[PDB]
Design a binder for these strands. Structure first.
Ligand code: K
Ligand code: K
Lengths: 115, 64, 64
DNA sequence: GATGTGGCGCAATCCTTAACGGACTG
DNA sequence: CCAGTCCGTTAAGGATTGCGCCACAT
């Protein structure tokens, strides 16, 4: 716990801010050339970012498959229907929606979707 | 009177705005009504046009 | 912050208000047009009816 | 001259979303 | 532990909206 609290937190060189087109670019190039894995390694090519951050940034924003379109009504029906069954099993529900990440649904549900 | 000018104006601005907020709602509604009306009318013009063209052909079918 | 917070908000505000001003301009337009054709169809309906009526008198009043 | 509108900035609030920080799997 | 995943939670900041000061058209 001690080493993890330091190596992954206190280190003052850990950039935890916004992503610049370049930063996002390096990740897209790499992930496109060597695949969406080995994030610890890929991260080494990014000053300040750790593998987890890169992974999360790719799966939620840079991956081309990720749709950035407005939520349709069909998707909503699926989500609501599925949530009644599974609950907050975002990952699970995510499999039912073509290009939506678990995070997208989690967000959509927690705001827009809750009446 | 400046104080008065203000107090009065702030009251006017609210009235002016409530008015416009209503006008906009009323307007959005007319769009529904009309579209609906316009729909039934376009229907009626079709209908009548048929009845008319029919009645005409009917006449054009009577012998001298 | 404050200084930038304000600058940034003011942009958002101008933006939001503009959007609204436009939607209300469209709706105001969509009504006019809908009122134009609506008036047109009304006339077309009047015409056809008259004709239908007239034509029918002529027909009922035929020889026998 | 007095009153009605359209703009605008301020602030408090409503709304979304990115992504951090634990926790779990194999 | 390691590399991947998952998920609750929340800061960050854009979108709204009520209030009042103003310019100035009516
Ligand atoms: K790195
Ligand atoms: K998916």
């Amino acid at each position: 716990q001690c080493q993890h609290r330091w190596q992954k937190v206190l280190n003052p060189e850990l950039i935890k801010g916004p992503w610049t087109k370049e930063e996002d670019q390096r990740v897209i190039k790499l992930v496109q050339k060597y695949g969406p894995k080995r994030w610890s390694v890929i991260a080494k090519h990014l000053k300040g970012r750790i593998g987890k951050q890169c992974r999360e940034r790719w799966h939620n924003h840079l991956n081309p498959e990720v749709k950035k379109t407005s939520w349709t009504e069909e998707e909503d029906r699926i989500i609501y229907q599925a949530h009644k069954r599974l609950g907050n099993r975002w990952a699970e529900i995510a499999k039912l929606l073509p290009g939506r990440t678990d995070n997208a649904i989690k967000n959509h549900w927690n705001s827009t979707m809750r009446r | 009177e400046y104080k008065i000018r203000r107090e009065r104006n702030n009251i006017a601005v609210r009235k002016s705005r409530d008015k416009a907020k209503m006008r906009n709602l009323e307007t959005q509604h007319k769009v529904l009504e009309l579209t609906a009306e316009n729909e039934r009318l376009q229907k009626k013009v079709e209908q009548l046009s048929r009845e008319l063209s029919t009645l005409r052909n009917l006449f054009k079918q009577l012998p001298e």
